[PDB]
Design a protein around this ligand. Structure first.
Ligand SMILES: [Mg+2]
Length: 386
């Protein structure tokens, strides 16, 4: 395995996203590749020829398929890893079945495992210094003038199982108000632009909704990803389709947002899960959309590359000044933004009790969403200082 240092190669085992790697036994994964994974805290295991099937091998490591990588030189492995929702499936082409393997469900195919990279450099959330404590040291948190970025759910707002029941954590409104008088603020969210705007309820700042595909400036200028916007009518049609197809089956919900269809199947019986999936993959094929899985949801999104780092970099390019970013996030999508804050930027991760001590690119930690309101207040006070 080639080592990539706080970066992302072509094929990358990413500890932040990947808790284990399941190797096909026929592969000869060197002791050097397993040791590489051992230093970054990633478990290994083998499945395959008459041995364990991928999902079983994953169960022995106490790791969900959504957090596991499979590496397989055979078709059965690739396919079984595909129907089991594995996060990353690397096909190893040793018999020139690159096309076959990718038809099976390989996310990507390599000839030799030394083409696979392992991300190094991230620390585990445990290990990180506290943001509040750093903010109050002699030299403060930032040397240069900042622009501050917030994820909404899990960061500014306490996690809730009812999406509609997400509200600003106590004190976070007065805090954002103070800070907003002091520097540019931006809240990021996967919710529609209107929803997050209403829930923060604070004007004269940047709102980025629908996964950064559309934002509002302080002056109220609307901005939208042009290429992504073309898929808006496409998605309304998939939603219309999916509602007729899955309407007969109770416990299955089709939720339509401006840049996505989400199909909730928490209350769906066994064997409509495969049927809920089959319909979304039909919607996929038919409309050239992008499917991604939640825990009990399947989502269709515009087939346009984008992440939270690109939102951040874009918003920054439009800020007046060389403005240094401070970024606060709660989960996995926020790792894209930690990675591009630059040599003076401050990436902060909000810890939860059930988060499991993930590896992260963030430099600091805030203990819960409650401290985020506290951090915001003191930041506004430290900037008023200078
Ligand atoms: Mg969140």
């Amino acid at each position: 395995f080639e080592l990539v240092v706080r970066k992302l190669g072509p094929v990358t085992i990413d500890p932040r996203r990947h808790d284990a790697v399941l190797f096909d036994t026929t592969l000869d994964a060197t002791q050097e590749m397993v040791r590489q994974l051992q230093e970054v805290g990633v478990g290994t295991g083998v499945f395959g020829s008459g041995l364990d099937v991928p999902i079983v091998a994953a169960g022995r490591l106490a790791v969900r398929p959504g957090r596991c990588v499979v590496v397989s030189a055979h078709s059965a492995g690739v396919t079984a890893a595909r129907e089991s929702g594995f996060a990353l499936i690397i096909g190893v082409d040793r018999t020139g079945c690159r096309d076959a393997l990718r038809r099976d469900g390989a996310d990507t195919v390599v000839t030799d495992l030394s083409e696979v990279s392992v991300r190094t450099g991230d620390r585990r959330m445990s290990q990180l210094p506290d943001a509040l404590q750093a903010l109050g040291m002699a030299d403060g948190l930032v040397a240069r003038q900042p622009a501050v970025f917030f994820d909404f759910d899990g960061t500014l707002s306490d996690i809730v199982e009812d999406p509609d029941a997400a509200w600003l954590a106590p004190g976070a409104l007065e805090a954002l108000q103070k800070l907003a008088a002091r520097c540019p603020i931006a809240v990021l969210s996967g919710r529609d632009l209107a929803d997050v705007t209403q829930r923060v309820g604070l004007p004269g700042i940047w709102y980025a909704g629908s996964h950064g595909f559309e934002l509002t400036a302080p002056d109220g200028t609307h901005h939208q990803n042009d290429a992504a916007a073309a898929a808006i009518p496409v998605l309304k049609q998939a939603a219309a389709e999916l509602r007729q197809q899955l309407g007969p089956f109770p416990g299955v919900v089709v939720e339509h947002k401006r840049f996505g269809v989400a199909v909730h199947y928490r209350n769906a019986a066994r064997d409509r899960v495969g049927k809920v999936a089959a319909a979304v993959r039909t919607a996929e094929q038919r409309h050239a959309l992008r499917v991604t899985t939640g825990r009990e949801v399947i989502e269709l999104r515009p087939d346009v590359d984008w992440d939270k780092g690109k939102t951040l970099l874009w918003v920054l390019d439009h800020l007046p000044h060389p403005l240094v970013p401070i970024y606060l996030g709660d989960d996995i999508t926020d790792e894209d933004a930690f990675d591009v804050v630059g040599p003076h930027g401050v990436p902060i991760v909000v810890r939860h009790t059930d988060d499991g001590d993930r590896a992260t690119a963030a430099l600091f930690a805030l203990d819960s969403p409650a401290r985020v309101a506290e951090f915001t207040d003191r930041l506004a006070r430290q900037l008023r200082e200078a």
